[PDB]
Design a protein around this motif. Structure first.
Motif, PDB file in Angstrom:
ATOM      1  N   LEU B 602       0.809  -1.212   0.000  1.00 55.63           N
ATOM      2  CA  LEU B 602       0.000   0.000   0.000  1.00 55.63           C
ATOM      3  C   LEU B 602       0.843   1.263   0.000  1.00 55.63           C
ATOM      4  N   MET B 603       2.057   1.199   0.532  1.00 60.31           N
ATOM      5  CA  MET B 603       2.948   2.355   0.510  1.00 60.31           C
ATOM      6  C   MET B 603       3.778   2.440  -0.759  1.00 60.31           C
ATOM      7  N   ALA B 604       3.849   1.360  -1.532  1.00 56.82           N
ATOM      8  CA  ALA B 604       4.653   1.367  -2.748  1.00 56.82           C
ATOM      9  C   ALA B 604       4.297   2.492  -3.710  1.00 56.82           C
ATOM     10  N   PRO B 605       3.031   2.794  -3.975  1.00 59.76           N
ATOM     11  CA  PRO B 605       2.712   3.847  -4.946  1.00 59.76           C
ATOM     12  C   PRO B 605       3.382   5.175  -4.638  1.00 59.76           C
ATOM     13  N   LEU B 606       3.733   5.388  -3.373  1.00 59.68           N
ATOM     14  CA  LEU B 606       4.381   6.623  -2.956  1.00 59.68           C
ATOM     15  C   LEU B 606       5.854   6.681  -3.330  1.00 59.68           C
ATOM     16  N   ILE B 607       6.444   5.564  -3.746  1.00 62.44           N
ATOM     17  CA  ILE B 607       7.863   5.538  -4.056  1.00 62.44           C
ATOM     18  C   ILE B 607       8.111   6.230  -5.388  1.00 62.44           C
TER      19      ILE B 607
END
Lengths: 51, 772, 158
Positions: B602-607
């Motif tokens: 879920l935090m990957a898109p922020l990378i």
């Protein structure tokens, strides 16, 4: 004569300021080196200057 | 060791007896305390006399024997005796000696390696000394002083606590093996305990003394004393050397101990949140409680929860009062009517109804109290003692020092008593708009007149004129007050007395449990109001430092940083117990299953998408290196994991890991985006916000069972499970059971499975489901 | 924690005679003195002791097969003569972060003929004039210094 001498108590919490014309009025307090340098000239003083 | 065996032999010998056996078998361990009193009971009337009568002897002191032999303390050193082999009657293991021997010890006795630990033991008194040294004295003068009596604090203390919070802290810092179950105050204040323990560890010390000194280090000595000038603990500790009834040793002591700043910050925060919750219309109560529990603040080095500080302080302000009321915190019997202060001395009464016409004919209900009562009052640099009688100000006396303050106090007093014709027929200037209900919330005519006075000075002058004016009779000239606030005049106000010298503040060691309404108005077992939201400044802007408003409404950050923070929060919440969590996987060295967690997904898109592979490689690398061996730092995995979701690639790693919002984190150094310290290993700082990591596992830094207690819990006793110590407690498996000894005379059974839920919600909700 | 418990933990039932590496970083040692070490450790070839409040290496026992050491983050000062007797077959050493005041302290290390690399960073000695060159002239056996050889040749990974 320039700015007169200043006084102070032991702890220095109080400090008085006097002009030159009146140093002949408190000569008994000033230190010797400053006194022996003042009495012989009191003759030539008029108000605050030296002739 | 052999000593242990000796203790066992002694226990056996003692159990061989019958009485000792009966007493060590019957009852619980608490009886010990009792036994501690029936023995060694002996006092003396005038110890001074007996001390001069004893020290005149040869061997008036007792002392240990083996300690002297081991220390090689001789006898008759230089024809002067030091001791002689004997046995005191009470101890039976001590020997008489003389005072001279003590000097011998101090001069040619055994020396310890270091003794600077003392400075920590008695830190309060070294602090006194230092505070003294940083003073700049001044001249001395003689004059009379207006010394008012009042209750104050004389000991500057940081993080003032209760007694129940202190008793556990002493045990957890000195006697951990004998420690009881972990209390909430510990789990919350971990770094504090760690600090206090780092100093008193691996040291030769007498521990009882240390505990006493800690009690003093956490006790603000409250006294009822005469006082003059400012009120600060830094001064009250040496008030004796600043001024008396006839003399004053001037000295500046403003820049020391940084105390009142904390209190004013606290009160500002309270005002802010109170206003915030007031913005609501039907749930301001729960809104305020949420804002409270959703907030924290820093004190010196540590971060403390707001609701915890509020219940420890004693600032009687209309803001702190409300909060302490919402949290069910008891408090004193002190009132507040706007800026002024009040305290009731005697009397009684009951509410009564009355009405007034605002403009022409406009009936408005206003209440008053139907009886005689007496009140003390304290405004800025001004005191007063007055009495109310059936909607009238009977009498009043004042001992202030200013005219303006005098007039303002008098006016607020007249209002508090509904004295005058204005309460009978209000002025034309006021209207229905100024009446009440900024947005619906009504306002009693009292605070109406209050703000009407604060608006213009001429309203105040007219109000004073509402009080009877007469000609100053002879003699009373000195005890009279004009309209300007002059100690004497030719014509003065009615029923007034003045004097030089403040009034002695009353005292009462009482506590009361009050409540409040949905409109933020507290009540005390009566129709009386102790606080409200109309008695505080309207509003103001301030920039709070070292604070955490971890609440949506009380937040200014954007969706990006907030999303990052919430992702980190969820990833930490996965730091609990049970398989599929990161601790079990580390124990199994399954460094791969971490990459496939849902939270990183879920935090990957922020990378940053153009370099997500390279960063991913590095992250996975670090993880394996830390996991394969066992020498890891939990504060770095929680940081780098969000990047391991993607596939590795090739490229040059500059040294930083960027997100999609031009905000990075660096692996090894703290930055604005992710910070932490070895001192407080139970916190993670992201964008200033703080996050509390649970205590389930302990890395190299954490060096005790304290980091594991949030992973354990109590369960049904099972005699089959083994009994172990507090150090092997780390070698158990998640979900297993084990017996253990706790504190004293108590054994239980624990299971390494946690329960994050609390009782607050599980009770509140179930309750609200009953009012239907 | 404490070096004793740390060690007893690292020794997962393993004898202190078949290990080749050990680490004790982020621990504590009373009086800055070693505690728990003996000559039993013979096959040990590596060591790491960092940030343990250490102040002297006097207690360190003989260790011949040891060929790499790390003592950073401590405050050791003037105990270098012991290393020669205990660990003469040593090659890699690290002391960045300790109290080294002058080149006189570093002279004994010349006897470590097996020495190849040395690491001194954040020490007072580095703040002198002509220190790298003077050190090289003192220890010709030493090749690398803080990761850089004469002519500033960056050393490889390993």
């Amino acid at each position: 004569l320039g700015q007169g001498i200043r006084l102070s108590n032991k702890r220095k919490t109080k400090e008085v300021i006097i002009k030159a014309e009146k140093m002949g009025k408190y000569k008994n307090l000033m230190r010797e080196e400053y006194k022996n340098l003042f009495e012989p000239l009191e003759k030539y003083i008029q108000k605050d200057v030296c002739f | 060791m052999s000593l242990l065996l000796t203790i066992a032999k002694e226990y056996k010998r003692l159990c061989q007896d019958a009485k000792a056996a009966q007493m060590m078998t019957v009852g619980t361990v608490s009886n010990y305390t009792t036994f501690k009193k029936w023995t060694t009971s002996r006092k003396e009337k005038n110890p001074s006399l007996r001390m001069r009568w004893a020290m005149s002897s040869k061997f008036p002191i007792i002392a240990n024997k083996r300690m002297l032999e081991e220390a090689q303390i001789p006898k008759e050193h230089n024809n002067v005796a030091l001791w002689e082999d004997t046995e005191d009657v009470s101890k039976r293991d001590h020997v008489l000696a003389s005072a001279s021997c003590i000097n011998y010890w101090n001069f040619c006795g055994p020396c310890v390696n270091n003794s600077e630990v003392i400075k920590e033991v008695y830190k309060s008194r070294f602090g006194r000394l230092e505070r003294r040294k940083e003073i700049m004295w001044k001249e001395l003068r003689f004059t009379l002083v207006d010394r008012q009596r009042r209750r104050v604090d004389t000991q500057p203390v940081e993080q003032r606590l209760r007694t129940g919070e202190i008793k556990d802290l002493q045990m957890w810092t000195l006697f951990e093996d004998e420690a009881p179950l972990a209390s909430k105050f510990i789990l919350d204040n971990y770094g504090l305990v760690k600090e206090m323990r780092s100093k008193f560890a691996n040291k030769p010390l007498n521990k009882e003394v240390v505990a006493h000194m800690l009690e003093k280090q956490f006790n603000p000595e409250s006294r009822f004393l005469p006082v003059f000038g400012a009120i600060r603990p830094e001064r009250m500790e040496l008030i004796h050397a600043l001024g008396g009834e006839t003399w004053i040793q001037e000295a500046n002591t403003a820049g020391i101990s940084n105390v009142d700043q904390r209190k004013n910050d606290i009160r500002a925060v309270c005002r802010k949140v109170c206003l915030a919750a007031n913005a609501s219309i039907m749930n301001a109560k729960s809104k305020l409680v949420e804002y409270i529990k959703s907030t924290s603040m820093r004190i010196g080095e540590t971060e403390r929860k707001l609701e915890e500080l509020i219940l420890e302080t004693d600032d009687v302000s209309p803001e702190v009062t409300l909060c302490k009321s919402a949290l069910g915190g008891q408090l004193g019997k002190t009132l507040s009517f706007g800026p002024m202060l009040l305290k009731k001395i005697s009397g009684s009464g009951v509410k009564v109804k009355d009405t007034v016409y605002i403009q022409g004919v406009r009936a408005v209900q206003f209440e008053y109290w139907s009886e005689q009562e007496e009140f003390y009052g304290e405004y800025k640099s001004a005191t007063a003692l007055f009495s109310r009688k059936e909607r009238s100000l009977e009498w009043i006396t004042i001992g202030g020092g200013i005219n303006e303050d005098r007039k303002r106090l008098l006016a607020m007093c007249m209002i508090f008593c509904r004295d005058g014709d204005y309460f009978k027929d209000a002025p034309a200037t006021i209207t229905m708009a100024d009446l009440s209900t900024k947005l619906g919330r009504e306002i009693p005519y009292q605070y109406v007149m209050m703000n009407w006075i604060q608006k213009s000075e001429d309203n105040l002058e007219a109000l004073l004129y509402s009080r009877g004016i007469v000609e100053t009779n002879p003699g009373k000239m000195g005890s009279s007050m004009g309209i300007d606030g002059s100690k004497r005049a030719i014509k003065s106000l009615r029923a007034v007395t003045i004097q030089s010298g403040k009034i002695d503040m009353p005292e009462s060691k009482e506590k009361i449990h009050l409540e409040l309404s949905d409109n933020l108005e507290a009540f005390d077992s009566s129709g009386r109001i102790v606080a409200t939201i109309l008695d505080l400044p309207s509003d103001k802007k301030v920039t709070f430092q070292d604070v955490s408003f971890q609440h949506p409404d009380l937040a200014v950050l954007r969706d990006e940083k907030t999303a990052i923070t919430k992702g980190y929060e969820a990833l930490i919440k996965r730091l609990g117990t049970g398989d599929n969590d990161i601790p079990s996987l580390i124990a199994k060295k399954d460094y791969l299953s971490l990459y496939n967690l849902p939270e990183v997904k879920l935090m990957a898109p922020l990378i940053r998408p153009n370099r997500k592979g390279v960063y991913s490689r590095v992250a996975r690398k670090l993880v394996s290196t830390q996991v394969t061996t066992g020498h890891y730092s939990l504060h770095e995995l929680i940081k780098v994991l969000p990047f391991t979701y993607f596939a590795p690639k090739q490229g040059m790693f500059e040294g930083r890991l960027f997100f999609s919002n031009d905000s990075f984190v660096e692996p090894g150094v703290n930055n604005n985006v992710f910070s932490w310290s070895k001192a407080d290993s139970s916190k993670i700082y992201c964008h200033g916000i703080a996050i509390r990591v649970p205590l389930v596992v302990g890395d190299e830094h954490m060096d005790t069972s304290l980091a594991l207690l949030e992973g354990f819990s109590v369960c049904e006793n099972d005699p089959r499970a083994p009994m172990v110590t507090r150090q092997d407690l780390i070698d158990v498996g998640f979900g297993q059971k084990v017996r253990l000894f706790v504190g004293q005379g108590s054994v239980r059974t624990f299971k390494r499975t946690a329960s994050q839920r609390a009782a607050s919600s599980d009770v509140n909700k179930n309750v609200k489901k009953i009012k239907m | 924690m404490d070096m004793k418990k740390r060690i007893h933990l690292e020794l997962r039932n393993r004898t202190p005679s078949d290990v080749k590496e050990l680490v004790l970083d982020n621990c504590r040692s009373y009086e800055g003195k070693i505690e728990g070490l003996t000559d039993e450790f013979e096959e040990l070839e590596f060591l790491s002791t960092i940030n343990v409040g250490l102040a002297s290496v006097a207690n360190l026992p003989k260790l011949n097969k040891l060929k790499k050491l790390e003592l950073s983050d401590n405050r050791v000062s003037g105990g270098l003569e012991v290393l020669a007797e205990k660990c003469p077959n040593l090659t890699h050493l690290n002391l960045s972060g300790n109290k080294i005041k002058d080149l006189g302290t570093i002279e004994p290390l010349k006897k470590l003929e097996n020495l190849k690399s040395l690491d001194l960073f954040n020490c007072e000695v580095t703040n002198l004039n002509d220190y790298r060159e003077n050190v090289f002239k003192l220890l010709p056996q030493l090749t690398y210094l803080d990761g850089y050889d004469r002519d500033d040749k960056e050393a490889p990974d390993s």
